[PDB]
Curated annotation (Swiss-Prot):
The chain holds residues 998 to 1005 of 1390 of the full protein. Heterodimer made of an alpha chain (50 kDa) and a beta chain (145 kDa) which are disulfide linked. Binds PLXNB1. Interacts when phosphorylated with downstream effectors including STAT3, PIK3R1, SRC, PCLG1, GRB2 and GAB1. Interacts with SPSB1, SPSB2 and SPSB4. Interacts with INPP5D/SHIP1. Interacts with RANBP9 and RANBP10, as well as SPSB1, SPSB2, SPSB3 and SPSB4. SPSB1 binding occurs in the presence and in the absence of HGF, however HGF treatment has a positive effect on this interaction. (Microbial infection) Interacts via extracytoplasmic residues 25-656 with L.monocytogenes InlB; MET can bind HGF, its endogenous ligand, and InlB simultaneously. InlB probably dimerizes upon binding to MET, which encourages subsequent dimerization of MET. The gene is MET. Receptor tyrosine kinase that transduces signals from the extracellular matrix into the cytoplasm by binding to hepatocyte growth factor/HGF ligand. Regulates many physiological processes including proliferation, scattering, morphogenesis and survival. Ligand binding at the cell surface induces autophosphorylation of MET on its intracellular domain that provides docking sites for downstream signaling molecules. Following activation by ligand, interacts with the PI3-kinase subunit PIK3R1, PLCG1, SRC, GRB2, STAT3 or the adapter GAB1. The kinase domain is involved in SPSB1 binding. The beta-propeller Sema domain mediates binding to HGF. The modification Phosphoserine is found at residue 3. This is Hepatocyte growth factor receptor. The lineage of its organism: Eukaryota, Metazoa, Chordata, Craniata, Vertebrata. Expressed in normal hepatocytes as well as in epithelial cells lining the stomach, the small and the large intestine. Found also in basal keratinocytes of esophagus and skin. High levels are found in liver, gastrointestinal tract, thyroid and kidney. Also present in the brain. Expressed in metaphyseal bone (at protein level). Belongs to the protein kinase superfamily. Tyr protein kinase family. The record marks 6 as: Required for ligand-induced CBL-mediated ubiquitination.
Amino acid sequence: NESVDYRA
C-alpha cells in the first residue's frame, strides 16, 4: 500500500 493511494 505504501506506494499507491487508496483512492487510486
